[PDB]
Structure formats: structure tokens, C-alpha cells
């Protein structure tokens, strides 16, 4: 979270929070309500986002579902869409937290080794996250989509 990150930065320097961290926390708690509304928007329509993003991903990379691909079969495609559900939930967690700390801790640390064991192509994950970002920015209105995109951007940069 923003508060946890500020506290950690202050502890690293063994000092109390200065006016900068304090008023950034005040801004963060002031804007918490609109963050909650944005998270509600993505939570209520999660299945739409997952299905649209899976469709766009398979359009861009049909080889994933093709014979010999990792997403070949109904079960493996279900696992793909379930991973997209995981990452959407993590993105909503990051939105409510105001930081990418939940995304990083739950789904970025060790993602390379995990998807290597599963033999999942990381680039395919990248287009999947980009499709999710396009859909989510489609649903959100104006500046809200902006910050949501940032989280998705980070996730893409995390996976590439």
C-alpha cells in the first residue's frame, strides 16, 4: 500500500514521516473512495473482461490453442482464463491499495520460474495482459482508466 511503502521508506532512513509522505498519505486516503468505485467497476464486470481478453489473445496468438500449444484443449484454455482472472483480481487489489505491492507480491515474484515450469510462454502472457488493459480502459471512464492502465502497464513490464 501507499502507507506501507511510506512507512518502509521512513524506517530505512530511521526517521519519522516528513510532510511529503504525510500529505501524500492524506491525498491517498482522500482519494480512496474513487479507488473503491473503480475497483467495483472492474469487479462487477470481471467475466466480460476475462472473456474479451481471452478472445483477443487467441486472435493475436492462435498458436496457443493450436495443437502443440500450451492452451490446447478445453481444460488448458480454462486454466489460461483462470490465470487472467487471477491477474484481474490482483489488479483490483493494487487499485484499492494504491500501489503495485499486491500485484508484485502475489503474482510477479517468481513468475518466470513458475511459468517456465508450466512451459507457459511469457510473451503470450504479455499480450494477454495488454488485451485485459485494453478492455478495462474501455470500461473505465476518463482519468480513472488512466491509473488502471498504469497497473496493467506495470504487470506487462513485470512479465516481459
Amino acid at each position: 500500500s501507499v502507507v506501507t511503502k511510506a512507512i518502509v521508506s521512513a524506517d530505512a532512513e530511521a526517521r519519522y514521516l516528513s510532510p511529503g509522505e504525510l500529505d501524500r498519505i492524506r491525498g491517498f486516503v482522500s482519494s480512496g473512495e474513487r479507488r473503491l468505485r473503480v475497483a467495483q467497476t472492474l469487479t462487477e464486470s470481471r467475466e466480460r473482461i476475462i472473456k474479451q481478453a481471452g478472445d483477443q489473445l487467441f486472435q493475436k496468438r492462435p498458436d496457443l490453442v493450436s495443437p502443440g500449444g500450451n492452451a490446447y484443449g478445453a481444460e488448458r484454455t480454462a486454466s489460461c482464463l483462470r490465470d487472467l482472472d487471477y491477474y484481474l483480481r490482483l489488479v483490483t487489489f493494487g487499485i484499492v491499495a494504491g500501489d503495485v505491492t499486491p500485484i508484485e507480491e502475489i503474482g510477479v515474484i517468481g513468475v518466470k520460474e513458475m511459468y517456465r515450469n508450466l512451459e507457459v510462454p511469457l510473451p503470450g502472457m504479455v499480450e494477454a495482459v495488454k488485451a485485459m488493459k485494453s478492455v478495462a480502459t474501455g470500461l473505465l471512464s476518463g482519468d480513472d482508466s488512466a491509473e488502471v492502465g498504469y497497473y496493467f502497464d506495470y504487470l506487462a513490464g513485470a512479465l516481459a
Binding site: 500500500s1 502507507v3 506501507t4 512507512i7 518502509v8 521512513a10 524506517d11 530511521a14 519519522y16 514521516l17 516528513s18 510532510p19 504525510l22 498519505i25 492524506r26 491517498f28 486516503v29 480512496g32 473512495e33 473503491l36 475497483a39 467495483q40 469487479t43 470481471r46 483480481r89 483490483t92 487489489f93 484499492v96 491499495a97 505491492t101 499486491p102 502475489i106
Partner: protein, 162 residues
């Protein structure tokens, strides 16, 4: 280190569930109390040296044997380490209050502290008395509500040590 928001995020992640009304209620409560927390934290940050001075004076007045020869706070280095410890307790209570959770106290303060003091020979009861001295000193500066809020963390430190 987890605050209230991170605690809700974790309790919803371990279940694999998306956020619902109850989680939004909890986060809204934290956002409501955030302004009080920030004001109290700023007040304590501005007056940290005064709080430490007042509380150390009160403790060494109530227990003068500490700073007299034969007391654990008798040398310049040991007095410095004593006020340094009081600075730790105040700063980390400020962190815990701002986060809204006592995880940082089990997490960065009280883990192995009893063993450390017992190895050093530091008095535990006197340190608890000093933590209180800081609590009464800080409550007056921060006001009634912020004192009620910081009291849970100071009492947490006292109970963990005791």
C-alpha cells in the same frame, strides 16, 4: 508489515474472492480514520524530541537508581542507548498507528526483544515504565482521540515486553 488495507487484501486473496461490500466497508472505515492518524503522526513527529525528553525525565525521576552508579543507565553510552530505545518505541508506535495495525510491533520491535534485553541485562519493568511515560506524554500533545488511538499500540508494546 501490513496495514489495514493490506490485511483486507490478504484476507480476500487467501479466499481467492473478489472484493464485496464488507471489504469496502472496512476500507472506508480506515479511510475515515486516516485523517486523525495523519494529524497525530505529524504532531508526534514534530514533538518527538520533546516527548523523549519529558518521558526520560519522568522515568529517571521515578526510578533514580537507573542513572546513578550501579544502574543500567549509568554511563554516557548506556544513557544514550536508553533514550535511543525510547526513540525506537515512539517511532514504531507512530508507524503502527499510521498503518492501523500492530503487525510492525510483532514484526520489527518485539521479536526477540526480551532475549536481547535479558542478555544485555536491561531492566524490563523499567522499560515498560518508560513506554508508559511516553504514552502519558504523547497523549497530552495529541489530544483525546489520538491518545485513545495511540494507547492501544503503547499498551501492545508494554504487554509484549511484560
Amino acid at each position: 508489515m501490513q496495514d489495514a488495507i493490506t490485511s483486507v487484501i490478504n484476507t480476500y486473496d487467501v479466499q481467492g474472492k473478489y472484493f464485496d461490500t464488507s471489504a469496502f466497508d472496512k476500507l472506508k472505515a480506515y479511510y475515515a480514520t486516516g485523517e486523525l492518524r495523519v494529524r497525530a503522526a505529524g504532531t508526534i513527529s514534530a514533538n518527538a524530541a520533546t516527548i523523549i525528553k519529558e518521558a526520560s525525565a519522568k522515568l529517571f525521576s521515578n526510578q533514580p537508581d537507573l542513572v546513578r552508579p550501579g544502574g543500567n543507565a549509568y554511563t554516557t553510552r548506556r544513557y544514550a542507548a536508553c533514550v535511543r530505545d525510547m526513540d525506537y518505541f515512539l517511532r514504531y508506535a507512530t508507524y503502527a498507528m499510521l498503518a492501523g495495525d500492530t503487525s510492525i510491533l510483532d514484526e520489527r520491535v518485539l521479536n526477540g526483544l526480551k532475549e536481547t534485553y535479558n542478555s544485555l541485562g536491561v531492566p524490563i519493568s523499567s522499560t515498560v515504565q518508560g513506554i508508559q511515560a511516553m504514552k502519558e506524554v504523547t497523549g497530552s500533545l495529541v489530544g483525546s482521540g489520538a491518545a485513545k488511538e495511540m494507547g492501544v499500540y503503547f499498551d501492545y508494546l508494554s504487554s509484549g515486553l511484560s
